[PDB]
Design a protein around this ligand. Structure first.
Ligand SMILES: [Zn+2]
Ligand SMILES: [Zn+2]
Ligand SMILES: [Zn+2]
Ligand SMILES: [Zn+2]
Lengths: 467, 467, 467, 467
């Protein structure tokens, strides 16, 4: 239904993802989904019966890569909207996920790493996209967050927002079960010997990586300054050992300095929102460990304007990326630690978007399809080099997730994922938005026609459809 | 698509709805939807090419009639479930309504009076059923309750249940608007001259009757013992006058003794839950006014077992029909005031039903399709004569709503709505459940095959339908 | 213990409360609590053994008068603080009330009209002040608001503030009982014949006037735009008749246009927050009735700055005096209706004050002891004539409450209540604050030494007092 | 002011606390507060000028000892009442504590170990009782729980009970600060090097022991089945080291199996509610470690009747000691692990007691003064030997807290704390209630006249005290 194809991208300035000086007048040649040639425009011969893109005056980048998204919108579920969204789309969750993957693809993102979702529909969706039955960014997933509750649990409550008080217990339980898949808060009650088979079995269900709740996920209920550990070190060791045994990358969720340190000491492949540290500044010693061990940190910043908006309305999530966490971000960049782009972004329900002010929407970090552009902009505002920002969004996630042999740069033998921009992203990082062409496994995408069948994005919503 | 038809019901004991002694060996003849003959079995000749029902050894009753239902389930929305239900079925509300009408029909109810619903979809649905485009009990409606808020308002809150705290404001506003249609709480803020055109315009939209919130609808928030008037008497006079001017019946919602008195003094055509009086006993004078004026009261009782269950778990709605309101019911029956069957019943979402204990489900007053049986049973437990109960569920509503010229009894010239029971309802009122045949405008109904397309009743609910 | 005394106020500009041109070089002579002479400084001889105040270059006004205060702080109880305050001072409520009366006196207010309080302690306190056993402004009271719930009732809840969820039921009930004294929400459930003896008995307990909840008091729970009537017109007629029969003035609490009209049609002696009308504009007809009938309206405005602060933080009480209610205030002033000064003000617990920003505190309308100054300022900002503002705070309340024979103006035979200001209130209404001297029944008050025994105002609060 | 004194307890059956067979016809001789002689009645000569108690036909036990109480009532604060209680008694907290210590003494408890309280008032109170300035059981205390929030924090919330929503922030903060004393939830955000001086400084304030929140205290918010660790193992090591360095016993608060294990691995001196384990059964290995290391566990059980009441009303705390935790209690007793009596009991405000049903009050585990009797009864119902139960309430706490050299048994040289019972506690453990005499340091107590000055127990509460 969809497949690896053949195409040539001709005569543009190449920014290949390996970090070097950009090379003008370059041609990239893709054959049956795989890059076969990269070189000077005139040394690469291209017969006229071959599909081509004219890149003259343009910039050629690898397919963009997002290290942390949620294709069922989890950030939304930490506030209002969880009930209405999950009820509205029950029966079609896999299509919601495909739609969200298409929206990522529309922003030039050819690979997404989904860090929290419901196992069943995310599996269905990735398999269909991978096999060509459906359109979208390719997906790799964790499934659930080991040791976290589902969306109708304390982990997604706020003091004045308690979904269970106004919804059926039956529906709330059914939803929690499809997210948790037995790997919820109850794990914290168990001895190591009982945890071992559960995590092993979970891993044998078919995840691409595993994310562990090293610390708690109660920021909504308790704020950002009272973190806990989910597990004893002993039980954490069991989890880590089983992930290593399964041979998939290990991710961590950490909410405190001690959490961060603990993650580092387990040589985590990728540390999600590493700079979110209980509003306490990251010590020098910890930064030095990151440098010495060369571990990947993902960070989730906020632009100057977005944060200023948040601060102006005393928003409950102002602490997420502001104040001390902002300063952490700055110091991390400055020390040159290895950084990965990720956003927690999702395809937010239009009824929920519709509630938001201009200020809330403007450079919102959690709006899938543009969240990566905003991340790059925010990082550069804090002193990140534009080239390093691009790598954070291309090569760096791929490496962290051990997929760099296949994607994240333009290199012979790798997958044929490419985007073409009209303006220079190194001169101005906001030029990342100037997408002209999107290609996935050598197949050009009609990216402006995405998503193919609006589902959550279908709007407005008519009360009585006569058929 | 569906129509008036021809049929004969032969050789049964006739209980015609006029309250006389039942007449055995009777035949009812219906031609093109209208009753043409009623008489002794042997005097009514019926050619063998005519469709027939053998009512030998059986009882023949008029099509059953419910004086107060909600085809979008309003009682549910006074607790948990409002968000999930309205979100899940947005785009199909008219089909939800039709499904609910079919469920009523399944219980032998050929006419329903819907007292609170969303104007747009209930209009669509009644027009489709009335024109034969869709199956179900025929519908007459009020639209909204004048002066009451919508489902995401204070009128449907409880102290610990505040749907707006966890749903989008946009969605909540859209739902409130489709129920309120400009006739919400803001009416109480206006002077009489500004109220007049609003109510007039509302009535011009095409309702079959009009129900006014004489008293408040804050039982959920404030309990049953702190009632208010919605309007000044002056403004109430405006509303009554415009209803009279439009020439449709006038219905009241009342919740206190003074509210009841006020309704009576306006010669209301039908008084909904007349016996719900702030848990204060109805005075003798008020009962005498009902007798003297001969006004119709609908009442909503609870069976002995259901109420005992409620009292046993200290249920927040125990006060709805229990204690003093139960006594009020008894005294009304005893004094022989004119009584109408009505239940506030709706087709409740299975996820919400699935939360309930045996005790909660057993003789639940709000379960559409059986609610009328339960009403009759409850009324008889409190001393009502079985024949008078049957009339409450056939003739009386039809009279109150000024439809007795067309339905509510078996009489030549009236519509051909009939049910056939296997056992004697006068011997035991629970025999009302022994339905063998259901006929609507001379057309026999496959009542066991209803509803035709389960929508809200479709269950279980699969997460990912592959199509 | 304290008494009527003799004193002379010499040689000031007299503003006597009767509204005329101020008369310079005036002397006021008080003997045994009563004003005996008012005239030209040189015509009034004063022996040197007589206590005197030199009002040279100063202004002489009558004792100031507040038409609506709460000496147990009710406005506070509509938000946070009710539990801690009532528990902290249980055993001493009468002293709390005395302290508050002293604080009013400190601001030059010699007479206060308390419109909602607990009957037992407010009785004890007024009797002790009236007899001279205790210091403070003299008090007249309503006791409770007929048909309103107590402070742990729905009448003082907000959606997110529900004191009963975190306090003992026993304590909540004991507090509700001391405010309600049987005249709470349950009155709305009763027939007229049962209401009559209750209100009659209540009036026999010894109130100075009676305030009826014509409309509801659910602004905290439901906002300002969904008002109700508490009582049927029939039951309201009973209450009004019994008040008339008891021969005390009649006050109303109203919250809507219709409520206001209804109060007018009952010839209310004083209508509390008359301009609070559901955020709908007062019609011309209604203003004309006020003029024609010459009824007294109290209004509760907000200053430009205070309201701007409220609007800037989207405060839940912004609607109390803002937007349309502000415009009502302007039109009432412009049309020259009779206006009375009143504020709902109380002596707010310092722990609650301590929570407040500068903007909240600045020109706060509910801060007893300065609330009258702020009222005058606010009214003048809206176009009121300074002289008319002074009358609103002197003569006008006295008339509404039928006490003008004894207080509210400087006139021979009236009580010797006087204040002396250093600057001209007619030149600038903020000069009302320039108090130099305060006199009550010819007794000069050390007003800066008030309150005599700080109780609620005692601050800071030490954890362990070693005695 | 109160002193060590001289007395002889003559001719009773001695149960000395060392666990041996009881010895009849025994006399105990105390001189200047200290036990000097214990032996056969006829070998111990006692001059007639010496104060004596006739223990003929009676039983002589050591002064009873409670290993876990809260002299400001903390259990209460986990539900309703916190605001009213702390506001009502501010200024007298030390006296509240003394009163509570006297109530313990009234039940024969001469020594209480307070495991959570506010440092300042508990210090005041113990010093006064220890010196003889004030009456009561002697007190040893932890102060706060290291890493737990105060009473207006998440640690004492429930989903529907959020005190901060209805009280002043200023008051809430002031109360949280007097309980937390800088050792609250923020500690979880710090690195080890910053924690070290804080804990050291805390320990230098003068506590008798130190209790560490190994696991969380969110049972109210989240239930009993989702526990967390408060600290990293690294930070926990810092805290333990500093406690050891200060030379005071180490207590742990644990709430899961892994928490229990962790506490065991730190050789905790006493483990509070050791059997409260996330409703998961304690593994055999863990029980073996307790046996092998001989560590003291306190447990908090519930009687058959109390637990049956809880289960019958679906009480939120049913999980505290019921189901699996009840079975843990049974197995711990059966395996003979070292057990300490403790209850979390407090002197509960009478307004809160007044809310409770008979069932709630009957064998309530948290009612100070009887809680120890109920503990012993509950433990025996689960198979504990009556002698071993008596030791759990005398000798065992003393040993755990390293006070056995001075108290907890009748032995020459130890303090003269003794109680005398009229019936045999070994025949029937409920006979522990048959107290005839109470002696503290050789001084007989008028136990029935305690507490000396009712403060919290003063009842009823009058609104307006005229003095
Ligand atoms: Zn996270
Ligand atoms: Zn109704
Ligand atoms: Zn008012
Ligand atoms: Zn504990």
């Amino acid at each position: 239904f969809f497949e690896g194809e053949t195409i040539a991208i001709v005569g543009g300035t190449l920014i290949d993802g390996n970090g070097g000086v950009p090379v003008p007048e370059t041609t990239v040649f893709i054959e049956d989904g795989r890059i076969t040639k990269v070189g000077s425009t005139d040394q690469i011969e291209v017969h006229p019966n071959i599909r081509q893109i004219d890149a003259q005056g343009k910039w050629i980048l690898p397919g963009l890569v997002n290290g942390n998204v949620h294709l069922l919108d989890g950030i939304m579920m930490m506030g209002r909207g969880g009930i209405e969204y999950l009820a509205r789309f029950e029966g079609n969750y896999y299509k919601v996920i495909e739609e969200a993957a298409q929206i990522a693809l529309r922003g030039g993102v050819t690979t997404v790493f989904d860090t929290w979702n419901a196992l069943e529909p995310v599996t269905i969706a990735r398999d269909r996209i991978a096999s060509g039955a459906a359109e979208g960014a390719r997906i790799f997933f964790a499934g659930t967050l080991i040791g976290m509750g589902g969306p109708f649990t304390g982990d997604f409550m706020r003091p004045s927002m308690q979904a269970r008080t106004v919804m059926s217990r039956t529906f709330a339980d059914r939803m929690d079960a499809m997210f948790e898949v037995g790997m919820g808060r109850h794990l914290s009650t168990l001895p190591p010997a009982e945890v071992r088979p559960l995590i092993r079995e979970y891993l044998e269900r078919g995840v691409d990586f595993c994310k562990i709740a090293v610390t708690d996920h109660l920021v909504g209920l308790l704020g950002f300054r009272a973190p806990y550990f989910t597990f004893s070190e002993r039980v954490l060791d069991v989890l880590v050992d089983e992930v290593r045994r399964a041979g998939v990358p290990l991710l961590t969720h950490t909410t405190s300095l001690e959490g961060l340190n603990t993650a580092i000491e387990r040589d985590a492949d990728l540390m999600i929102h590493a700079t979110m540290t209980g509003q306490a500044p990251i010590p020098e010693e910890t930064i030095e460990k990151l440098l010495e061990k060369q571990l990947w940190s993902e960070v989730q910043p906020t632009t100057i304007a977005q944060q200023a908006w948040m601060d102006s309305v005393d928003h409950p999530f102002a602490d997420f990326s502001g104040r001390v966490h902002h300063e952490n971000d700055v110091r991390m960049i400055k020390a040159g630690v290895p950084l990965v782009l990720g956003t927690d972004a999702g395809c937010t329900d239009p009824d929920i978007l519709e509630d938001m002010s201009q200020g809330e929407l403007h450079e919102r970090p959690w709006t899938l399809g543009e969240d990566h552009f905003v991340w790059m902009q925010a990082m550069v505002e804090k002193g990140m080099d534009p080239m390093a920002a691009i790598l954070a969004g291309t090569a760096n996630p791929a490496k962290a997730y051990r997929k760099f042999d296949e994607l994240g740069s333009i290199d012979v033998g790798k997958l044929g994922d490419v985007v073409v921009l009209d303006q220079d992203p190194l001169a101005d990082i906001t030029n990342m938005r100037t997408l002209s062409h999107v290609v996935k496994e050598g197949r050009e995408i009609d990216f402006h026609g995405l998503p193919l069948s609006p589902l959550v994005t279908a709007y407005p919503r008519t009360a009585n459809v006569l058929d």
